[PDB]
Amino acid sequence: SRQLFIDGEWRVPILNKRIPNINPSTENIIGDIPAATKEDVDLAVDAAKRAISRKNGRDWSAASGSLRARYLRAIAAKIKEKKDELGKLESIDCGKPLEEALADLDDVVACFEYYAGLAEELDSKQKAPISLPMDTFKSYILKEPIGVVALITPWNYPFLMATWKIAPALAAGCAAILKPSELASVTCLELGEICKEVGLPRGVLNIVTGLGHEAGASLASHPDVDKISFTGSSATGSKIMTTAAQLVKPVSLELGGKSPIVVFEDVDLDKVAEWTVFGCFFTNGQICSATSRLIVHESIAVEFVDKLVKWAENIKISDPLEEGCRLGPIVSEAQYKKVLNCISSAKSEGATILTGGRRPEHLKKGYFVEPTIITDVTTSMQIWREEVFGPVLAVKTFSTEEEAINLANDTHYGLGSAVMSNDLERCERLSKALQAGIVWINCAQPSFIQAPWGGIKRSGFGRELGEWGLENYLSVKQVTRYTSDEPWGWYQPPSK
């Protein structure tokens, strides 16, 4: 089995500890992953520092973008080869249905190809001139890699989230240390073998697996890390930023959400019913930007919600590998219990569990929850307030557009949001009013790698994907030159 990927080969953790890896659908130990600690992390950062240091002959940061692009394209092609096997490992690892995992793999491939392309273009973008009011000065800018980057990623899209950061980071000329989640580490470790098979220069990508408070914390607080890029819980992101503050290092954060989907009356109920079920139940409801607060016009509310109930109850719940699986199990026991507790608390606070809310009868084992719709929701309820990370939808109703937007913005979060109405004039109005980083019109959840992705407010800051994803790993350098041959003439010259 795999060890830590450091400096271009496999290294066993110094303390030789290992973490059990559970299959979410069976509850059986399916294997394990290495548990890295402080000094394992220290080796990773040194290797990354060495990968980009001047006196390295294969200086990754000083290489041309097209050279890095060749590595990225090769990484992509090797992943494309293993598509079917990597997707199967993905499903077993995190619990998402096979068709979802296979789609993620396609996106991984596209993501490396896209940033390979951007890497090629980057050389043309260097030395971009700045127009000045004086003729005595000339000015341009250089786009330089930020340096050594810590990449800390979630378990909901294990391989894709990692790729969302490593592809732009490498394309920019950075050396990376990746810390995937201890709940879903397998495919990211497979990326280490791919790097070996493609001859990625030593130390450019290092993969350190283990516990968040051991490996992750050590990585985040290491003084030689130049930038931390994070995706995960609000609390951990806060701790990570606190740690980064010690040595004043830049940070990008993508944290939870509690995204609204605003459904108006002038809508095809059935088409938008699939979207609202998708926005909340897809990835077993473990989406950062999940549209988990439904805000439906009162005039269609009860018939629209009834449709939702039928769609949701027709969703096939099974082992992720079984043909036709549209919902898998929650990633872990601890997560399962949190999701069930959220449903329990909603019931306790007086809300209605319209459908789901329990373990399905036909599956005795595994962390399975039926798609859950919750109504009679009040704005002070925990279910309205707190991100669930389970297939759980909370429903509220509205009578005016103004009320709809006030309900939509009734959260300290600000990641995603969706508007559903045929009136496109209304959609544009609502897309401006919704306090979010992403606004979907007449759909919910699609993330194209060409378009900037991120949140505002307690959902964090910074943008991934598109050209924004690359910039996240560049710094701007102003090169200003004095063209004239005249003395500056500010101070008095001495005498000679």
Ligand X SMILES: NC(=O)c1ccc[n+]([C@@H]2O[C@H](COP(=O)([O-])OP(=O)(O)OC[C@H]3O[C@@H](n4cnc5c(N)ncnc54)[C@H](O)[C@@H]3O)[C@@H](O)[C@H]2O)c1
Least Cβ distance, residue 184 to Na ion (angstroms):
5
What single letter denotes the amino acid at residue 246?
A: Q
Tell me: is residue 175 an annotated ligand-binding position: no
Q: Which residues contact 228 (CB under 8 A, 6 or more apart)?
A: 149, 150, 152, 219, 220, 240, 244, 249, 250, 251, 252
Least Cβ distance, residue 415 to ligand X (angstroms):
8
Tell me: is residue 298 an annotated ligand-binding position: no
Least Cβ distance, residue 411 to a copy of itself (angstroms):
14
Mask: binding to ligand X, 374-393, rule CB under 6 A, as x and -?
A: -------------x-x----
Q: Residue 343 and residue 392: Cα distance in Å, rounded?
A: 8
Is 254 tagged catalytic? yes
Q: Residue 361 and residue 358: Cα distance in Å, rounded?
A: 9
Asked if 288 is part of the footprint of ligand X (rule: CB under 6 A), the reply reads yes
Tell me: is residue 460 an annotated ligand-binding position: no
Is 174 tagged catalytic? no
CA distances 20 to 149, 225, 341, 424, 431, Å, are: 28, 29, 25, 51, 45
Select from ligand X, Na ion, a copy of itself, none the partner in contact with residue 358, using the beta carbon and a kind-dependent cut-off of 5 to 8 Å.
none
* Residues across the chain: 496
CA distances 166 to 71, 231, 243, Å, are: 12, 13, 22
* Residue placing its CB nearer to ligand X in the complex, 62 or 456: 456
**Strand runs labelled E in 130-248:** 137-145, 148-152, 175-179, 205-207, 227-231
Asked if 196 is part of the footprint of ligand X (rule: CB under 6 A), the reply reads no
The pair of structure tokens assigned to 403 is 């009320």
- Contact (CB, 8 A) for 107 and 160: yes
Q: Residue 283 and residue 315: Cα distance in Å, rounded?
A: 13
The pair of structure tokens assigned to 422 is 């045929």
How many residues bind Na ion, per CB under 5 A? Answer: 2
Q: Which residue is at the shortest CB distance from ligand X?
A: 212
Q: Residue 321 and residue 98: Cα distance in Å, rounded?
A: 5
**Annotated catalytic residue: which of 94, 174, 188, 288?**
288
User: Which residues inside 12-71 make contact with Na ion, applying CB under 5 A?
Assistant: 21
Asked if 319 is part of the footprint of Na ion (rule: CB under 5 A), the reply reads no
Tell me: is residue 387 an annotated ligand-binding position: yes
Mask: binding to ligand X, 235-254, rule CB under 6 A, as x and -?
A: xx--xx--------------
Tell me: is residue 239 an annotated ligand-binding position: yes
DSSP string, 261-327: EEE-SSS-HHHHHHHHHHHHHGGGG--TT---EEEEETTTHHHHHHHHHHHHHTS-B--TTSTT--B
Tell me: is residue 234 an annotated ligand-binding position: yes
Select from a copy of itself, Na ion, ligand X, none the partner in contact with residue 448, using the beta carbon and a kind-dependent cut-off of 5 to 8 Å.
a copy of itself
Tell me: is residue 226 an annotated ligand-binding position: no
User: Can you list the pairs that 242-251 forms with residues at least 24 positions away whose Cβ atoms lie under 8 Å?
Assistant: 243/217, 244/220, 246/221, 247/223, 249/225, 250/146, 250/226, 251/227, 251/462
Asked if 93 is part of the footprint of Na ion (rule: CB under 5 A), the reply reads yes
Select from ligand X, Na ion, a copy of itself, none the partner in contact with residue 236, using the beta carbon and a kind-dependent cut-off of 5 to 8 Å.
ligand X
Among the listed ranges 36-44, 89-97, 213-221, 338-346, the one in contact with Na ion (CB under 5 A) is 89-97
Using CB under 6 A, which of 25, 91, 156, 259 touches ligand X?
156
Least Cβ distance, residue 216 to ligand X (angstroms):
3
Select from Na ion, ligand X, a copy of itself, none the partner in contact with residue 477, using the beta carbon and a kind-dependent cut-off of 5 to 8 Å.
a copy of itself
Asked if 256 is part of the footprint of ligand X (rule: CB under 6 A), the reply reads yes
User: Which residues form the interface with ligand X (CB under 6 A)?
Assistant: 154-156, 212-213, 216-217, 220, 231-233, 235-236, 239-240, 255-256, 288, 387, 389
Residue stretches of the annotated binding site: 21-22, 93, 183, 232-239, 288, 387
Give the residue numbers annotated as catalytic, written as ranges. Answer: 254, 288
User: Which residues form the interface with Na ion (CB under 5 A)?
Assistant: 21, 93
